[PDB]
Amino acid sequence: CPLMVKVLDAVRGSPAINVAVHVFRKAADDTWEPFASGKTSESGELHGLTTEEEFVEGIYKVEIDTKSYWKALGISPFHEHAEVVFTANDSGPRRYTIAALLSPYSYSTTAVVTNP
Amino acid sequence: CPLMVKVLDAVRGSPAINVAVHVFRKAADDTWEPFASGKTSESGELHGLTTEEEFVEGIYKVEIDTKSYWKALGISPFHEHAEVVFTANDSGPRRYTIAALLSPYSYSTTAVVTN
Amino acid sequence: CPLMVKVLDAVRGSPAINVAVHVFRKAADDTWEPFASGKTSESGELHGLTTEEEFVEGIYKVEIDTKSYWKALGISPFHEHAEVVFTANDSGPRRYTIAALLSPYSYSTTAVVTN
Amino acid sequence: CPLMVKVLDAVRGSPAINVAVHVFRKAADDTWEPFASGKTSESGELHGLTTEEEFVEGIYKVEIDTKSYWKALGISPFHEHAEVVFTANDSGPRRYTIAALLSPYSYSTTAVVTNP
Ligand SMILES: O=S(=O)(c1ccc(O)cc1)c1ccc(O)cc1
Ligand SMILES: O=S(=O)(c1ccc(O)cc1)c1ccc(O)cc1
Numbered sequence: 216c217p218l219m220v221k222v223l224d225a226v227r228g229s230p231a232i233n234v235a236v237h238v239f240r241k242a243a244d245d246t247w248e249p250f251a252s253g254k255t256s257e258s259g260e261l262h263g264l265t266t267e268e269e270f271v272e273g274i275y276k277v278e279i280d281t282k283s284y285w286k287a288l289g290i291s292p293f294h295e296h297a298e299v300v301f302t303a304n305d306s307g308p309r310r311y312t313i314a315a316l317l318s319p320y321s322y323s324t325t326a327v328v329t330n331p
Numbered sequence: 332c333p334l335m336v337k338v339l340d341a342v343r344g345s346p347a348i349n350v351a352v353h354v355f356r357k358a359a360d361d362t363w364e365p366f367a368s369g370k371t372s373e374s375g376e377l378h379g380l381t382t383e384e385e386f387v388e389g390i391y392k393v394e395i396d397t398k399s400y401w402k403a404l405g406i407s408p409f410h411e412h413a414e415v416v417f418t419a420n421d422s423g424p425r426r427y428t429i430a431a432l433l434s435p436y437s438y439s440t441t442a443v444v445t446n
Numbered sequence: 447c448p449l450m451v452k453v454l455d456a457v458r459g460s461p462a463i464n465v466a467v468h469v470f471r472k473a474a475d476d477t478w479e480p481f482a483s484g485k486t487s488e489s490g491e492l493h494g495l496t497t498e499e500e501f502v503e504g505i506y507k508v509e510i511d512t513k514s515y516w517k518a519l520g521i522s523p524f525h526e527h528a529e530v531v532f533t534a535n536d537s538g539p540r541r542y543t544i545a546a547l548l549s550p551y552s553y554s555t556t557a558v559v560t561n
Numbered sequence: 562c563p564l565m566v567k568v569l570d571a572v573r574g575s576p577a578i579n580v581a582v583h584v585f586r587k588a589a590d591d592t593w594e595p596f597a598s599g600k601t602s603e604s605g606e607l608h609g610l611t612t613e614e615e616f617v618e619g620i621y622k623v624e625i626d627t628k629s630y631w632k633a634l635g636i637s638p639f640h641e642h643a644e645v646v647f648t649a650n651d652s653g654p655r656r657y658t659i660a661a662l663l664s665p666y667s668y669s670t671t672a673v674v675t676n677p
């Protein structure tokens with residue numbers, strides 16, 4: 216599990232449950248190719264998106280579908296989604312945790328990068 | 332004025348209006364002494380808290396009454412207030428902007444220090 | 447101007463100066479079309495991006511070139527850039543301020559929408 | 562473990578290690594009485610501050626010694642510390658996670674509150 220996503224809800228003070236996440240990887244023709252997807256669990260975490268073999272060097276985009284999350288709770292938010300774009304594994308394999316904190320008109324995102 | 336406070340509301344995407352703000356200065360006996368206070372304007376800003384003459388080096392605390400703000404909007408908050416504690420240091424001319432972004436169970440605060 | 451961008455630096459406690467910002471509008475064929483761009487000023491702000499005539503309802507993306515900013519300061523960043531994607535909706539007069547607070551491995555963004 | 566503290570470093574993209582944390586509780590005379598203290602581990606987490614029996618109703622202050630953290634890394638930060646003040650257990654026992662994200666001139670704090 217070299218890529219994990221955590222999401223928290225700043226209005227409720229709780230994990231953000233059932234948040235859809237789509238990961239893309241930039242292809243040779245400079246388009247975003249679908250790479251992996253999933254949803255956050257009751258703990259707000261999304262595990263098992265990829266494997267060490269599959270998660271090669273590249274530029275990755277982690278799209279967090281924040282609008283669908285808020286609308287399912289009856290709230291009209293500002294952003295369409297949160298996009299996190301980064302180069303991965305350029306100095307060898309690393310483990311990446313993408314963390315996000317959500318409010319209807321604001322969000323924060325952090326990266327925790329560790330070396331196995 | 333060398334000290335200004337700005338407060339934003341992350342739930343409504345708006346300035347945080349009519350928020351009470353209290354500034355304290357640390358006295359020699361280690362207690363917090365009232366220094367200045369006010370309420371944020373329609374733009375979420377509080378100007379005119381102090382003057383360069385009065386804002387000497389020392390430790391200051393800015394207390395933002397976030398609980399009352401959320402209660403007035405019918406929203407149940409977590410924190411009693413937001414506290415920002417910092418040292419004022421002289422080191423050339425200095426303007427201090429204390430910014431805060433409020434959510435019911437979260438807040439962020441930033442210091443913008445400019446010449 | 448109905449759209450403004452503000453960028454702050456959380457490491458130095460200062461405006462983020464000379465940061466490139468690109469705005470795109472979603473076209474009918476689902477691609478991102480260049481719409482406006484500029485560089486943040488000494489106050490970290492980018493004004494005059496568009497006009498009320500041109501800023502019609504639709505989906506917009508604001509791209510902040512954070513990687514170049516940190517590299518110019520000798521700091522190694524994580525993100526390629528910061529992207530802010532939102533729908534502009536009419537619903538009375540509307541000013542949009544897109545604010546961003548930058549750290550090397552983190553960023554926050556807020557929308558302040560005022561009448 | 563009804564009270565836990567997590568701290569992340571936004572400059573390094575890593576847990577904030579060896580951050581001192583002091584917890585206080587408002588006493589009957591309206592002073593802050595020392596309640597518990599500890600330091601974050603290599604994971605950035607501080608466990609074992611208190612017990613269900615000890616952690617009664619009250620107003621609590623969690624002081625995170627951010628200045629000492631940055632100065633130990635050779636950085637001159639803005640804030641003296643981060644203070645998180647809240648009423649706890651007013652509707653019965655809850656579990657509280659205080660999370661913080663640190664930059665030299667900025668910090669964010671969130672609360673995750675769950676019911677056992
Ligand atoms: O979800 S968090 O608590 C988190 C904790 C440890 C990690 O390695 C990653 C995320 C969190 C994330 C961001 C934030 O601003 C506050 C808490
Ligand atoms: O740039 S800010 O100070 C700002 C203040 C008032 C506004 O109406 C708009 C922007 C700012 C930016 C980010 C943040 O988290 C807090 C304050």
Ligand code: NA
Nearest residue numbers: 304305306307
């Ligand atoms: Na290489």
Ligand code: NA
Nearest residue numbers: 650651652653
């Ligand atoms: Na009660």
